[PDB]
Every structure is written in structure tokens, then in C-alpha cells.
Design a protein around this ligand. Structure first.
Ligand SMILES: CCCCCCCCO[C@@H]1O[C@H](CO)[C@@H](O)[C@H](O)[C@H]1O
Ligand SMILES: CCCCCCCCO[C@@H]1O[C@H](CO)[C@@H](O)[C@H](O)[C@H]1O
Ligand code: NA
Ligand code: NA
Lengths: 417, 409
């Protein structure tokens, strides 16, 4: 028990914090600010984070730590566990103080500037277009099954395709909700609650088809290269600069979307979308030295691994409706989702074949590793089919491709609305 | 080419330009989110340029304060001169007060500064080094009050605007939090207090390094393991220890007597207790330190942009550069010297050495000063002691201040 850690805190220490939480709770004394917010969010997220991480079935196939937190957290608002004050504190961090944006800003920046200048520019020509091909196939098949299921083209694109292809929960579902609310007007929690649910279904199908394409690859060897895609031939300060660039790149994106270039056409370009383009540009410009480029990564790690659990406590409070989540686990979606994955498989297989890669390998990295739950999923997918050596490719899909999906989404959303 | 090798806030001039261009686009277009992201974006960039400028200036850097002073003055001049936009003022203030980054900042500092100190060193230090510090404070107060009564300034003002701020651990750690405690207990604006306190404190800092060389002449005449996670736990403990302090001050123990105990004061006691309890492993204890470094070294400059905007009046700063104050300040330092000399003699230390570490290294500008003081007298090997004064002693000063303030009011 003492050797057991919660969020890297021994049980004795965690108790100290958990006691404090309860003192604030009983006495109903809590500042509705950053400090008060994080204090709660950290502790609550910590316990339920570990709980969702330890659970076997749940951990590998549902999402684990983050899912457990954003569900539990929402149940606290539903069940009336939280105090008005505590809800205020948490919401004040997420929306008023706008930690959500910072979080996403840091992620975008670190994910894009991490990728090496050459790898990025090179990847564009072959691997990037394959990804786009996968998306086309994912959309075309999705729309096809939706039209068969009497669901309009809007919904299929916004609540199924885009969210599935997006890079997971924190990186796809969460920011797509924000873009959705900024462009339609409808609540975020309506969207996230459905999107997170479908996305998770697809994540389970992605790891299943990964093993199916492995069997097909080993049965029909002319399609699979044995694990090879192609057919032929720092200190605090750096990390701090990452933070500067994270915010600065968001501000530029913001000034562009609000004043300079509000709309390429009728279509309104959301500031997050712009950011991806800006950061990507900043990478190619090479204004950032490799040390700084890593600094940005080191930040995104710190956020993704330490502050993610905090974020989820807030996501369950503001972005999560437990009812819509339940309502989206319809047996019909399970089919729609699965088929969209298949659309991505065939889309990336065709695309990669056209770009010079092996169809099987392309469908795994530029296809399934897109439809999977961002990073966590890449590991789980590439293990089902033994292709763990392409992890570097898979992350290009989950990172750059996930960034693509936001830009695409900002356009899809607007023009559709 | 050489310029391009020139870095601003660890950003090459080309890169900084990218940011500085963005700042100006936000400025011209008047498009800026009044939130964390928008705030830090500005504060980072502005603080960066003026931070370096104040750091490079020779006279200014060593004796006035340097990077942070330059920023909190320039920043205030921007509000005064109307350089900043209402939006930009809002963004920055929203980060400092609404979002309350100030408290987090102080919370992180307190936690990392106290939990860094080794359990034994802390408990041991209490018996001998700590009481010496208290003796120095007594002497600093008694001499201060003496000169103030001579100058027709009441005992309140001497204790609140001169003694406490001087003995406190500098700008970010003493002056800035003492303003917060002052405003929480009197009701009067923070900027009124900070603007005077920062000014006197800086004067004393210059006297401290001078007397350090004077006492030198009189003396000669007569685990390393770390992870992001540990640092993150530092953040948890920083906030958690503030929350406990807060719940205690607001509900459990609002007042020991008529006197109201401010939550920051409680925090110091709580964190110190948490250290002695040893609930925190050395890895975690370092984690808290590693955070406070990241804050103190990276986010300090941001903080100062906000301190010039909310906590700084340029007029009161000018008005406190009183030649009368120059005398009052100097004497308070002398009071600390003799106070720590007597105290240390009683505790078994050398009077000269005690007056330097438990005396001048108190009255100096926190950590920054300790280096400048221990260089004037060649005692650089006591830096570890000096930091106990600047850290633990600075924490003491807040607890004392919360009591002094309340009972006086
Ligand atoms: C027990 C293994 C199950 C495999 C199912 C497919 C059975 C064989 O499949 C057939 O094999 C031929 C090669 O000889 C191919 O030319 C055909 O395209 C293929 O469909
Ligand atoms: C409000 C957000 C504050 C984020 C600050 C995170 C700074 C963490 O910074 C990290 O600290 C670690 C611990 O020493 C080091 O090992 C890493 O190299 C360093 O970059
Ligand atoms: Na996906
Ligand atoms: Na001082």
C-alpha cells in the first residue's frame, strides 16, 4: 500500500491531498480560480485516472485513465456530488481562464514542431497525400453507410468521420467540439458526447482489422512488404520557449482568423485550423533550432502526461453529457463506425499503392493509425499486426494527420453549415 | 551574424522577431483574447525584451535589480503612458487576478523553497540558525522604529513599509506577497504598498552589499533522480498546500486571536510541517524545487509584466526615493547586523559570519542578493546558509507579517 503510488504520490502523501480536498468540500471553502481549480482537478483526476488505468478490459479497449476521469467527473455533476463552487472553479479554469485553449495550443505546437524539417517536407509528397486518400475513402464509405441508414451527410461527416480520423480524445474529439461550437452554435457537450463515443468504437475496430490485415498480408504476400512501407529506395529555458511559441502561434492564428483572413470564402477558418498551418509553416521556415523544437515537444509531454488528467476532470464537467454518450452506443453506429474504418483501409491502401508504398503497410500507418485513438492507439494497433517498427510513421499520422483533420474540419463544418 | 547568435529569452533574434511581429499584429488589429493564452503571449514577449535590456545594463543590473525591475517599471509606464490597450490590460489583469496566476506563482515558490530544504537541515537549523534570524529581525525592527520615531514616522509605517519589506526575500518572494497580505488585511491598494516597499527594499539591498565589505574589513581588522512526474507532483503539492492553508484561514482557524492569519502565512507553516513530517520522498521534494526553478527563472518575467500593470505605481516609487528613507533603510540594515551578530554570538556562531548570513542575507534582495553580498565580503562558501535565510527566513517574514499587519490594524 505505501509502495503503491497514485499519480506518482505514495498513498500516505495522496491521503494528505485527499484529506485537504475533503476539508474544502465539507467546509465549502475554495477559491474559484486556477489554484483552487487545479488543486481539485489534480487530486480527483489522479485517483480516477489510476483506477481507469488499472482496469484490464477498460484500459486497453475503452481508453483507460482519461475516459474514466471524464465519465466519473460528469457523473459528479449529474449526481450532484460537486459543489457549485467546485463546478465554478473547474469551469473557470477551462473556459474563463481558458486553460483548454492553452492546452490545445501547446499540443499543436509541440506535435508539429517536433517533426524534423526534412521528414515533414519529404513526408508531404508521399505519406501525407496517402493520409488524405484514406480520409476521402473514410468519408465516401461513411456517407455511403449513412445514406443507407437514413442519416444525413452532415452528421456522418461531423459526428462520425471527422472525429474517428481525428487524433483521439484530447487531440481530436476535444478540439473538434470547440470548432463545432464556434461554427454551428450548438453545445460542445452535445458533440463531444457523441464523437468520443463513436471514436472509441472505431478504435476497437482499428486494432481488430489490424490483425485481419496481418492475416491477409501473410496469406497474400504480394500486398505486404514484411514490415516496410516503401516499394523502393535542452533545459528549462528551451521548454519555456516552447510555451512562448505555443501562445504566440495561437495569438497569430487568432489575429488572422478574427481580422486578417476571417474567411477564405463564405467558409470561416477557425483559429485552431490556422494555428496548425502557422506552426507547420514555422517548422518548414526552420526559424526554430532543434533544441527549441524539442523544447516544444518536452512541453507537450508535460501537458499530455501530467496535466491531461486535470483536463479530463474539466472535460467531464463542461464538454460531457453522459446521456448522449449512452445514446450513441447504438448497435447501428457500431456498424457505421466499423465501415468508415474499412473505408480508411481501402482509401490508404489505394493511395499508398499510387504513392509507391505497400498497400497493407499503408492501410495500417496512414489508415488504421489515423482512425485509432491518437498516440495510445498506434501502440495498440501496431502490436495486433506485428509492425511495431513503423511507430515513427504511425505518429506522423496521429500528429500531422490529426492536425490536418482540424484544418479539414474547420472547412467541412463551415461549408456544411 | 553575431546579433543573430544573440538570444532574447533563449530565442534567437530571428525567432523573437516572429513573436514580436505577432505582438504588433495583435496590437494594431486590436485582436487579443483576454485570457491565459492571450495574456502569457503578451507578457512573455514584452517581459523577454525588457528583461534582457534590464539584465544587460551594467549599473542597473547589479545594484537596482535588473531584469525584473526593468520589466515592472517599463510595464507600468506602458499603462501610465497609455501604450497598452484596454484589452491588453484586461488580458494581463485576468491572468494575474481573475485566473489568479499570482497566487499559484507564490504557492509554487513557497512549496519548492521550503520542501527543498533537507529534513535534518531544517529541523537542525531551527535550533541555532533560525533563532539568530529572529534576533536579526528584532534588531532590524528596534533600530527601524528608533529612527522612524526620530524622523516623525509612526511605528506602523516603519514596520509595514520599511522593516518587513527589507527583511523579506526580495521582489517576487517578499514585496509582491507582502502587498497581497497588506491588501487582504488593511483594505488599502496593493500598488500603494508595493510601490513604496520595492523602492526601500532596493535601497537596503545596495546598503547590504556595502556593509558586507565593511564587516569584511572589520573582520580582518579584529537522490539526483528526476522525472516530469515528480515536478508535476510539486505542482499538486503547491496547489494542495495552498488549499489547506486557505480552508484553515477561512473556516477552521480564521484568527488565533483578534489577529487574522492570512492564508499565505498558514501555507508556510503547513509546507514546513509537511517537510518535517517527511511525507514527501527526496525525489518529490526536488520535484517541487524543479518547479520553483521553472517558475522563478522562466515565468518570473511574465509575472513582472503583470506586477507593473496591477501592483505598480510609478509615482509612489519616485516619492519613496527619499534621502530621509536612504538613511532610515541603511540604519535598519545596521539593526539587522547587530541583531544577528548578538544572536549568533548567543547561539555559538561567529558574530561577523552571523551578521552576514542571518543579517545582511536577510535584508538583501532574496536569492539574487546573496550572491552579490557574499562576493563583497569573500564568504561565497556560505551560500548554502544565505539561501536558508532568503528562503526559510523569507517564509518566516510572511508569517510574522500576517501577524504584525493584523494586530497593528
Ligand atoms: C485456411 C486459410 C483460409 C484462406 C482463405 C482463402 C483460400 C484461398 O484463396 C484463394 O487462393 C488462391 C491462391 O491459390 C488465390 O488465387 C485466390 O485469389 C484466393 O481467393
Ligand atoms: C503552468 C504550467 C507550468 C509547466 C512547467 C513545467 C516545467 C517542467 O520542466 C521540466 O522539469 C523537469 C524536472 O526537473 C526536467 O527534467 C525537464 O527537463 C524540464 O523541462
Ligand atoms: Na482516430
Ligand atoms: Na530582502
Amino acid at each position: 500500500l505505501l509502495g503503491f503510488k497514485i499519480f506518482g504520490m505514495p498513498l500516505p502523501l495522496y491521503a494528505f491531498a485527499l484529506i485537504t480536498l475533503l476539508l474544502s468540500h465539507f467546509y465549502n471553502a475554495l477559491p474559484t480560480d486556477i489554484v483552487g481549480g487545479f488543486a481539485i482537478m489534480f487530486i480527483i483526476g489522479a485517483i480516477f485516472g489510476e483506477i481507469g488505468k488499472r482496469l484490464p478490459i477498460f484500459n486497453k479497449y475503452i481508453g483507460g485513465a482519461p475516459v474514466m476521469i471524464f465519465l466519473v467527473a460528469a457523473y459528479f455533476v449529474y449526481a450532484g456530488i460537486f459543489t457549485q463552487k467546485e463546478i465554478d472553479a473547474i469551469s473557470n479554469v477551462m473556459d474563463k481562464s481558458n486553460f483548454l485553449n492553452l492546452f490545445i495550443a501547446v499540443l499543436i505546437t509541440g506535435a508539429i514542431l517536433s517533426v524534423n524539417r526534412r521528414l515533414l517536407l519529404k513526408s508531404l509528397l508521399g505519406y501525407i497525400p496517402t493520409i488524405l486518400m484514406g480520409i476521402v475513402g473514410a468519408s465516401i464509405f461513411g456517407i455511403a453507410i449513412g445514406l443507407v441508414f437514413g442519416i444525413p451527410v452532415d452528421r456522418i461527416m461531423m459526428l462520425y468521420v471527422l472525429p474517428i480520423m481525428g487524433g483521439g480524445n484530447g487531440a481530436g474529439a476535444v478540439p473538434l467540439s470547440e470548432i463545432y461550437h464556434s461554427v454551428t452554435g450548438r453545445s460542445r457537450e452535445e458533440y463531444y458526447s457523441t464523437a468520443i463515443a463513436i471514436l472509441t468504437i472505431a478504435n476497437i475496430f482499428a486494432i481488430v482489422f489490424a490483425a485481419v490485415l496481418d492475416i491477409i498480408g501473410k496469406k497474400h504476400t504480394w500486398l505486404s512488404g514484411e514490415g516496410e512501407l516503401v516499394r523502393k529506395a535542452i533545459t528549462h529555458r528551451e521548454t519555456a520557449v516552447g510555451l512562448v511559441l505555443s501562445t504566440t502561434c495561437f495569438l497569430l492564428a487568432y489575429v488572422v482568423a478574427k481580422k486578417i483572413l476571417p474567411s477564405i470564402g463564405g467558409v470561416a477558418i477557425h483559429y485552431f485550423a490556422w494555428m496548425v498551418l502557422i506552426v507547420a509553416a514555422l517548422n518548414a521556415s526552420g526559424l526554430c533550432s532543434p533544441e527549441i523544437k524539442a523544447g516544444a515537444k518536452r512541453l507537450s509531454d508535460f501537458f499530455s502526461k501530467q496535466l491531461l488528467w486535470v483536463l479530463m476532470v474539466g472535460v467531464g464537467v463542461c464538454y460531457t453529457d453522459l446521456q448522449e454518450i449512452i445514446n450513441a452506443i447504438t448497435f447501428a453506429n457500431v456498424v457505421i463506425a466499423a465501415i468508415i474504418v474499412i473505408g480508411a483501409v481501402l482509401g490508404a491502401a489505394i493511395g499508398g499503392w499510387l504513392m509507391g508504398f505497400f498497400p497493407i503497410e499503408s492501410a495500417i500507418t496512414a489508415g488504421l493509425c489515423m482512425a485509432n485513438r491518437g498516440g495510445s492507439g498506434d501502440l495498440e494497433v501496431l502490436s495486433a499486426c506485428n509492425r511495431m517498427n513503423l511507430i515513427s510513421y504511425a505518429q506522423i499520422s496521429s500528429r500531422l494527420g490529426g492536425g490536418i483533420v482540424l484544418v479539414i474540419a474547420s472547412i467541412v463544418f463551415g461549408m456544411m453549415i
